[PDB]
């Protein structure tokens, strides 16, 4: 519909590229180095045009291994356009827990390109409705990888925190905060502000775990916020939470 031209080398190597992807269902070439000649605009036609979306569990996985060999790193936006053709269909489409392969494939890919991966995909997985156990278990594995370095858990934080908070945000976020991810009090306060805005078992345990690891980061004012946040009597384990709270006082 849009009248965009793929780079002439990609229109040329468009069927060699279509060969190679098929090959990966049965060390990388130069054909994969031609993606550096795509803008994300042209790349967007190109993702749709390679029909990456229908690749096998096997087929996708080998592929992901190749992109991670690439020497000039893929641009933020370009790297993101990819993700959404590669995974995001399968992630959204997930019904039962992702293949060891897509966990591995996603996690390994996420390992290099985590900000583009997670800056792109986390939001929509969670800004999708009917997000179930199947979806959460891989963003669980995302945060839990050793490879997801402190710096990147911090960048995950800038992202997890910018989203509307529901139950699905908290469970993943407890497991990011479970490491003792470093906080500028700027973000910790917002986490606490945001935390402090609520009936939920998930949220109970989230608050609890914050107040044991970032006791250290609890101000007088934040402990007031926690006094506010524990007000509920739906709160299970209240004795625990208030015992931990009272223990800060």
């Amino acid at each position: 519909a849009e009248s965009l031209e793929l780079p002439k080398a990609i229109q040329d190597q468009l069927p060699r590229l279509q060969q190679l992807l098929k090959t990966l269902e049965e060390a990388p070439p130069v054909e994969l180095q031609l993606l550096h000649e795509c803008s994300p605009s042209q790349m967007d036609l190109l993702c749709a045009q390679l029909q990456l979306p229908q690749l096998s569990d096997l087929g996708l996985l080998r592929l992901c291994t190749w992109l991670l060999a690439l020497s000039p790193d893929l641009s933020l936006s370009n790297a993101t356009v990819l993700t959404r053709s590669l995974f995001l269909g399968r992630i959204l489409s997930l019904t039962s827990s992702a293949s060891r392969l897509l966990t591995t494939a996603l996690t390994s890919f996420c390992a290099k390109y985590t900000y583009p991966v997670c800056s792109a995909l986390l939001d929509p997985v969670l800004q999708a409705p009917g997000t179930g156990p199947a979806q959460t278990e891989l963003l669980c594995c995302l945060v839990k990888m050793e490879s997801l370095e402190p710096d990147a858990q911090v960048l995950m934080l800038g992202q997890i925190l910018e989203l509307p908070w529901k139950e699905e945000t908290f469970l993943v976020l407890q497991s990011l905060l479970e490491r003792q991810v470093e906080m500028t009090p700027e973000k910790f306060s917002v986490l606490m502000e945001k935390l402090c805005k609520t009936t939920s078992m998930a949220y109970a345990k989230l608050m609890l775990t914050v107040m044991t690891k970032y006791q250290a980061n609890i101000t007088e004012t934040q402990r007031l916020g926690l006094a506010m946040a524990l007000e509920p009597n739906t709160t299970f384990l209240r004795k625990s939470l208030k015992a931990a709270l009272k223990h800060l006082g």
Binding site: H36, S39, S41, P72, S75, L76, Y115
Partner: peptide
């Protein structure tokens, strides 16, 4: 050269700065 590429292929100044930081 990487950044010379990034200047000609990049849409906006915004995106350029995201990349130049990364």
């Amino acid at each position: 050269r990487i950044v010379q590429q990034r200047m000609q292929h990049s849409p906006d100044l915004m995106s350029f700065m995201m990349e130049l930081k990364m």
